[PDB]
Amino acid sequence: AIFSDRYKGQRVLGKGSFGEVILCKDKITGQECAVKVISKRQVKQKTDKESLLREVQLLKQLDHPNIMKLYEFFEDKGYFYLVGEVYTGGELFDEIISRKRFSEVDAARIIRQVLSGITYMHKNKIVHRDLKPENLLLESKDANIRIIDFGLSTHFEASKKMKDKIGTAYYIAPEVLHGTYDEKCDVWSTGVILYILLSGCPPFNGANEYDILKKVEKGKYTFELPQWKKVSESAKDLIRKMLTYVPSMRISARDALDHEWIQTYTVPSLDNAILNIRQFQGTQKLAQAALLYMGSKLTSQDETKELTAIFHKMDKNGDGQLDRAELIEGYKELMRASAVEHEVDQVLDAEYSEFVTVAMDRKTLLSRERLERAFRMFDSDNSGKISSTELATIFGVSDVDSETWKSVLSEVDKNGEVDFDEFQQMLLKLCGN
Numbered sequence: 001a002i003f004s005d006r007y008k009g010q011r012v013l014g015k016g017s018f019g020e021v022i023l024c025k026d027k028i029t030g031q032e033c034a035v036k037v038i039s040k041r042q043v044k045q046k047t048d049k050e051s052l053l054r055e056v057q058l059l060k061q062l063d064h065p066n067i068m069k070l071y072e073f074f075e076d077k078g079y080f081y082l083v084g085e086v087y088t089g090g091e092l093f094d095e096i097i098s099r100k101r102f103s104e105v106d107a108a109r110i111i112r113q114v115l116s117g118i119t120y121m122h123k124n125k126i127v128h129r130d131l132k133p134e135n136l137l138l139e140s141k142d143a144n145i146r147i148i149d150f151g152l153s154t155h156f157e158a159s160k161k162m163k164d165k166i167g168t169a170y171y172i173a174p175e176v177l178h179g180t181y182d183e184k185c186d187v188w189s190t191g192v193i194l195y196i197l198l199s200g201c202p203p204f205n206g207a208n209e210y211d212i213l214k215k216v217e218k219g220k221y222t223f224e225l226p227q228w229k230k231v232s233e234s235a236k237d238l239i240r241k242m243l244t245y246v247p248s249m250r251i252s253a254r255d256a257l258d259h260e261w262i263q264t265y266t267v268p269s270l271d272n273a274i275l276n277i278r279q280f281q282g283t284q285k286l287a288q289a290a291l292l293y294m295g296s297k298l299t300s301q302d303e304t305k306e307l308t309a310i311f312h313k314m315d316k317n318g319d320g321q322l323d324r325a326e327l328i329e330g331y332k333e334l335m336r337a338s339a340v341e342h343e344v345d346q347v348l349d350a351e352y353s354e355f356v357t358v359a360m361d362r363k364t365l366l367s368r369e370r371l372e373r374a375f376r377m378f379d380s381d382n383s384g385k386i387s388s389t390e391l392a393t394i395f396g397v398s399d400v401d402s403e404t405w406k407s408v409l410s411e412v413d414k415n416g417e418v419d420f421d422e423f424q425q426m427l428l429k430l431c432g433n
């Protein structure tokens, strides 16, 4: 069976773990679906085909209101296609940062759902392993949470590219790092999220990946921050049970559901936590957009040169001009079909050198507008500028050498703060331009 025989692409939803996710639509029923497309090139399998197929098969049979429903699985030469239900309420944290009030009641209601889903999957012997806020989609303000990506980390080796690793270190259980992990690792990650929901700061933090992993490996954290004063003791107690180092001594998903805090809270507003979550979230999203911008730029540069050499070879009259059919055949060649023809017609609606420019810009702006937007979001004072402290944090999360970005900053900030355009120049310099 062919994926494109049944489904057509509509919109790109974004980059997710192990692959990009596309909103697709059934050619018969008009049923909208979300599809994760995994490139066999970019991702190494950890298991045999049989084990993966069987997990897929089980997943298709599983049903829980807090777990993303998987419908279908496809495989071709270079790709796996995992087709499941579309959720439209976006990521939990984005909704949370746009709230008047947030209390232990809200956090308890969130955690109940997460725990219920986790409990269900653990009963079925399935571990997430890479569980984080971005894995938590809302179904549609009271709408249920659907956990995405369950079952992937067992069959696929985690990417080494920083673009994909962004923000994972905060949430990963220590025993996962060492290779000996079980279902309790999902409890740890869930413990970290609760900690953030109640303080707006990760319990294990740092200026870069390794500093965070180092705090995680050590296992120590505190409720020292002033804002923990406005938080019940039973919540903090649950965190302690969830953030227990040894997994055998760590509370199960099921027993967490019965905990005093979950029972009781399913009352003042934690304003500081909201402010810290908003700062935290903006930072992670800006760092991420920044890395994605550099990546799209390079990919663009690569494809720009490759497409030019194709359009040059196709110019068998040597004039620099070409017709529509040539462009289509060339664009098809770059990838080596309805989606290409449509894309071509959109560009043409907007001399092959001019075509290359606009076409690539049409990728340069998915990430350019995400970048501008994340920048404006981050600049909550609307000052138009970023401080050196803020830069350090962003590049540190981006894992860009402190001395390297400082260097680049020196060439542009010849005169202690940067605007958006400077920041973007910094990034261009940081990708060989």
Ligand SMILES: Nc1ncnc2c1c(-c1ccc(Oc3ccccc3)cc1)cn2C1CCCC1
Pocket (backbone or CB within 6 Å): 013, 014, 015, 016, 021, 033, 034, 035, 036, 059, 068, 070, 082, 083, 084, 085, 086, 087, 088, 137, 148, 149, 150, 151, 152
């Ligand atoms: N189904 C979805 N609906 C809405 N958004 C989704 C998804 C999915 C998604 C991803 C993979 C997938 O495939 C599997 C999921 C779980 C287990 C196995 C495969 C199903 C849905 C990701 N996202 C993301 C992309 C970035 C932000 C929102």
